[PDB]
Design a protein around this nucleic acid. Structure first.
Length: 76
DNA sequence: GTCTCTATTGTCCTGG
DNA sequence: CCAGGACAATAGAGAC
């Protein structure tokens, strides 16, 4: 089948925030949510971002362990 | 009912 | 070795 690629620090911080938006603005389109996420991301000071970089890190290590060999080969 | 596009950041792959 | 891309989450919008 098709194995997904790991979530980076931003994508991890994205899920959490997106929910808090999806629960507050249930009908706001996700494309616009992405726009606002990208902006809030630039607001969060660098220091605050560490926890997610570490979080995202283990996410990748586990990824290899679970999927011994998967080449990220996307193409058009 | 079924796909494809919409958008963000970060990260890996390819062509030149 | 750099630019340009695909793609991870997410559901709706639009074509068909």
């Amino acid at each position: 089948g098709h194995i997904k690629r790991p979530m980076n620090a931003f994508m991890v911080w994205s899920q959490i925030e997106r929910r808090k938006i999806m629960e507050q603005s249930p009908d706001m389109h996700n494309a616009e949510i992405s726009k606002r996420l990208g902006k809030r991301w630039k607001l969060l000071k660098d220091s605050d971002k560490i926890p997610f970089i570490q979080e995202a890190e283990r996410l990748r290590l586990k990824h290899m362990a679970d999927y011994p060999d998967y080449k990220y080969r996307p193409r058009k």
